[PDB]
Amino acid sequence: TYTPEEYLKNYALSVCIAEGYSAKEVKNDAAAAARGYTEFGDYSLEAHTAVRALAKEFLAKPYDSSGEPMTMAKCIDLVHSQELQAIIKKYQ
Amino acid sequence: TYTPEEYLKNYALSVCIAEGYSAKEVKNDAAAAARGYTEFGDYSLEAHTAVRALAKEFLAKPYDSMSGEPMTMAKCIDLVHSQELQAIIKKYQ
């Protein structure tokens, strides 16, 4: 199993990747993963929407890359961030 | 921001996402991220190639899905939390 916190972090990564790339292949796949972490998770739908909002905040940050958008790095930083931890502790 | 084990975990997820999806957009971006996470001050070249082998094994597993999507994202998440990845980290410590 994952813990509730780990599920909400998996959800964070999954929605971040689904939001941050345009390829339908990936949006659809990561979206289905995010739905699964929400259904097996314990956090409220509100906690989930605040995580999604935070993911968009991270994706909106301009990273210096290589010429790549560095989405992958933004989503990894999101999962590791003090900001996501604050959301977890607001709701826990 | 990251210990060397957290970097190797970031590498693992990046290479898994680069390997796991067809789309060049995501492939190029995730591969570029994996290069950034590649360091050899605590994890050898061989530690990395074992991480990549393990990612490809995770991607090879069939996952059930009510959506009919392959669940690549879930496979890669499972990789990063796997005992097999921990064993790599311990071995090459």
Numbering used by the authors:
A (entry chain A): 27 to 91, 93 to 119
B (entry chain B): 27 to 119
Provide passages from the article that reported this PDB entry.
Some Gram-negative bacteria target their competitors by exploiting the type VI secretion system to extrude toxic effector proteins. To prevent self-harm, these bacteria also produce highly specific immunity proteins that neutralize these antagonistic effectors. The opportunistic pathogen Serratia marcescens has recently been shown to utilize T6-dependent secretion of two family 4 amidases, Ssp1 and Ssp2, to mediate antibacterial activity. In S. marcescens, the resistance-associated proteins Rap1a and Rap2a neutralize Ssp1 and Ssp2, respectively.
Rap2a, like Rap1a, is predicted to be localized in the periplasm and could only be produced in soluble recombinant form using the E. coli Rosetta-gami (DE3) strain. It is also a stable dimer in solution as shown by size-exclusion chromatography. The structure was determined at 1.9 Å resolution with four molecules, arranged as two dimers, in the asymmetric unit. These four molecules, sub­units A–B and C–D, are similar overall, with r.m.s.d.s between superimposed Cα atoms ranging from 0.6 Å (subunits A and B, residues Thr27–Gln123) to 0.7 Å (subunits C, residues 27–127, and D, residues 27–126). Minor deviations from NCS are observed in a five-residue loop between α2 and α3 (Gly67–Leu71) and indicate some conformational freedom in this part of the molecule. The ASA of a Rap2a subunit averages at approximately 6110 Å2; the range is from 6140 Å2 for subunit C to 6090 Å2 for subunit D. Dimer formation occludes an area that is approximately 20% of the ASA, which is indicative of a stable association. A disulfide bond between Cys42 and Cys102 links α1 to α4 and interactions of other side-chain groups on these elements of secondary structure help to create the helical bundle fold and in particular to align α2. Together, α1, α2, the α2–α3 loop and α4 form the dimer interface, giving rise to a twofold NCS axis, and a combination of hydrogen-bonding, salt-bridge and van der Waals interactions serve to stabilize the association. The side chains of Leu39, Ile43, Tyr47, Val52, Met99 and Ile103 are involved in van der Waals interactions with the partner subunit to stabilize the dimer.
